[PDB]
Design a protein around this ligand. Structure first.
Ligand SMILES: N#C[C@H]1C[C@@H]1C(=O)N[C@@]12C[C@@H]1CN(c1nc(Nc3cnn(CCO)c3)ncc1F)C2
Length: 275
């Protein structure tokens, strides 16, 4: 739609980076603040084409706004950044954390109804607009679920967010809509630990696995997940919220709530704490 011209984009700062992509804050000055995502200098390029196409077709209050092209991806600038960056610095209350959790489920329910799985649902991908507004802000691993199949066939990459993954992704390389609920449960844990690094999923799971394990991190991970071991209950996380988390972490994908199931549950649980 909108065609931003590169010569008018004024770099302000970096907002994020991955092994294949970078997001920068720009000032579009043809005489507005934009987040522009660029792929680094064919498989990652084809995946990049699908990424832009995926966000082009998404419109939801809890999904970062697609703003047009420049290929570079121009998106709205979400002012307070990732909850991963925000949370260790702002002691947000339980009620607001649960509102964020609900807002994530809404955007996820919407994403899922569009037949897309996210595959990278983490606090680093949840952007804070204001103290009462959150948006899923990155779709780098988002894929369409093929029409005659209930999941997408992943394939291992060294950069897979394995500490946010259900055993089916790690073992069978099958990503279901239910696999994003697992990730959501991990994002909910992150939010309740205030994104504290010493409490993070890679820190906590590597403490459980150990680091002398050769090529066997994923395998030791899958087997502890299969033994029913899980991330611990965050300090000051209510018993009920912890049980909802564990329910998101059922080993059986079908036993997990869907995002639709989570919306009324979170709505009720937020209303309770907001009082
Ligand atoms: N892998 C990989 C890496 C490259 C992919 C990446 O950076 N994706 C993103 C989720 C990050 C941030 N981001 C965006 N961030 C913002 N706002 C904003 C304000 N402060 N900050 C920094 C404190 O977090 C960010 N508005 C739009 C965005 F799009 C998009």
């Amino acid at each position: 739609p909108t065609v931003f011209h590169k010569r008018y984009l004024k770099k302000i700062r970096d907002l994020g980076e991955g092994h294949f992509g970078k997001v920068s804050l720009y000032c579009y000055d043809p005489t507005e603040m934009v987040a522009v995502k660029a792929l680094k200098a064919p498989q990652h390029r084809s995946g990049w084409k699908q990424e832009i196409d995926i966000l082009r077709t998404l419109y939801h209050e809890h999904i970062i706004k697609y703003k047009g092209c420049c290929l570079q991806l121009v998106m709205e600038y979400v002012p307070l950044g990732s909850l991963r960056d925000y949370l260790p610095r702002h002691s947000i209350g339980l009620a607001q954390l649960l509102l964020f959790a609900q807002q994530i489920c809404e955007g996820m329910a919407y994403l899922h109804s569009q037949h897309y799985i996210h595959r990278d649902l983490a606090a680093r991908n949840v952007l804070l607009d204001n103290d009462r507004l959150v948006k899923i802000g990155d779709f780098g691993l988002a894929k369409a679920v093929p029409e005659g199949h209930e999941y997408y066939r992943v394939r291992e990459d060294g950069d897979s967010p394995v500490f946010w993954y259900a055993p089916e992704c790690l073992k069978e390389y099958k990503f279901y809509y239910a696999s994003d609920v697992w990730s959501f449960g991990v994002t909910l844990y992150e939010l309740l630990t205030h994104c504290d690094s010493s409490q993070s999923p890679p820190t906590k799971f590597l403490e459980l696995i150990g680091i002398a394990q050769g090529q066997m991190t994923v395998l030791r991970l899958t087997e502890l997940l299969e033994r029913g071991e899980r991330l611990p209950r965050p300090d000051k996380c209510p018993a009920e919220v912890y049980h909802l988390m564990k329910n998101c972490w059922e080993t059986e994908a079908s036993f997990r709530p869907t995002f639709e199931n989570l919306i009324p549950i979170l709505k009720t649980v937020h209303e309770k704490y907001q009082g």
